[PDB]
Symmetry: C3
Subunit: 227 residues, 3 copies
């Protein structure tokens, strides 16, 4: 159920909150329209994460789902978060590399399917089916990481060194971090309950904060965001 993980939810709420304030209080005197975009995108990521983490701490983002033969605690707020949040992160990567509109649309589409499909899995009552959705969701993710690693890097090679190197760091951080989510999900309370909801919430928190605040920090503190 949901009570002992309250501390990781409170800390996540706090970290996303402070992360938003910091990015806000840093893009204030920015005149460059390109940099402006990066700050707007990057600042909204933790801001959204803040509201959803708060809904989980306060209990609104938690529901109960029966499967296997029990009532399981499912924090559905994560999907609401990730639905807008993961595409924004992808958008940062795309602008940095100047991706084609077509690929940006393919990426956002793949991402929406990944999260939507992951949400359906989390709320499915037939235990066995949850894993089918997990598989579809993971296939979507793999497609996204493939394009960022192989497709985007190539695109980054045509920009100036500052941009190419910052993209490289951001690229490595998201590929590694993003692939941990399906694993956490599979072994957590949403799948084979090997790991307790307590530790699971701590894992997602570290992952979320790293994939947003950290990512944001690496990006917003480089000159890559400038023309």
């Amino acid at each position: 159920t949901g009570r002992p993980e309250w501390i990781w939810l409170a800390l996540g709420t706090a970290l996303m909150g402070l992360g938003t304030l910091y990015f806000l209080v840093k893009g204030m005197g920015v005149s460059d329209p390109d940099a402006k975009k990066f700050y707007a995108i990057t600042t909204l990521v933790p801001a959204i994460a803040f509201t959803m983490y708060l809904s989980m701490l306060l209990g609104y983002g938690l529901t109960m789902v029966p499967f296997g033969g029990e009532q399981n605690p499912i924090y559905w707020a994560r999907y609401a978060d990730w639905l807008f949040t993961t595409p924004l992160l992808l958008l940062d990567l795309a602008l940095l590399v100047d991706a084609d509109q077509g690929t940006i649309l393919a990426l956002v589409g793949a991402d929406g399917i990944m999260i939507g499909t992951g949400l359906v899995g989390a709320l499915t009552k037939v235990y066995s089916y949850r894993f089918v959705w997990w598989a579809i969701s993971t296939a979507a993710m793999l497609y996204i990481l493939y394009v960022l690693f192989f497709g985007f890097t190539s695109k980054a090679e045509s920009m100036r060194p500052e941009v190419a190197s910052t993209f490289k760091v951001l690229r490595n951080v998201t590929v590694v971090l993003w692939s941990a989510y399906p694993v956490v999900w599979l072994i957590g309370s949403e799948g084979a309950g090997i790991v307790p909801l307590n530790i699971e919430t701590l894992l997602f928190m570290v992952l979320d904060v790293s994939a947003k605040v950290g990512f944001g920090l690496i990006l917003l503190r480089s000159r890559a965001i400038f023309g």
Copy 2:
């Protein structure tokens, strides 16, 4: 509960409906692609408002939420409306002033959070928490009004007199009207039930019709929408 406010819901449905028909039957012979955008955006605002007002009149947009120690009548359709509707209005303002993509994204993002956060508050069962969400939602709104008043006006000063003056009127109308919503919400059935759902529905109706049909009228009947 919901029954005696049926008249304000029926009138709102009617006014949004006639408002859509009028804007539609006015943008028919418009060749200017810029003006076309304004008509498309502005016409969809009342059209959406029409469908949601109708759902409330017919009872579908009403739900019951327990909090304090009672079953409260919450018209959730408003948020569904405002979720697409408020950003469209912001988009009209942005095109008129030729805002940067970055700021447009920040505004739409702030707006989505404002409505989403306001929806969560309206459906929260812990009476005390509803106000936390209200606070977050209001902070988001204040951020939006700040940019429209101080940021956009500056941008409008670089356009021709017709555009600058129409923007000024639209700006004053939305800043004043938008700030009334959180007050109505706070004192209405969603917050401290000082005002009866009856009078509350009448307030939102006047506010909604003014902020859409009125706004649309001020905009679509000026030459500001032309290049």
Copy 3:
């Protein structure tokens, strides 16, 4: 109820699935950014259709709605599908014809209302009201078909013969196919239950597969998608 139509749901799932794989394994070596857009848009249509068809086969996309004086089986997954799917198809048509942003926004808006309004109708408990929503939804559709037939054709006349002719075929296929949906809905389980859910699911399947895979095939196998 839902059980005997499982075969049409399984076949639809299969066809959308194979349809996605085929389009994916065809746009692989495409360098043209314009063609790229078409492949991205067109491939995502069946991909989304796949996930929603699967949710219906597995039972998640089915709910029960009381109206008339009974518990009716309503596959709500269709709307989730169509909400993103119909606009994407419209986007293909718009790019092919190089439509104005204003009209694209009017079309997407009309489309969202059509599906949203159709969803509300499908879930409404007052039998009589369901048809009011159906009427509003159909009016929205008629507005869309009008613009595609009369507005877009004109726009297509200014492109080269390959584009104009492919647009013509796509135009005829969507106008005819799209208008069948409201009829199926009206006579199916969502409206006057003249046709059994069994036959209804078979009708939507043929319509869906034709309006996506077929449409995609006609488009992706022509040179129209190139500059």
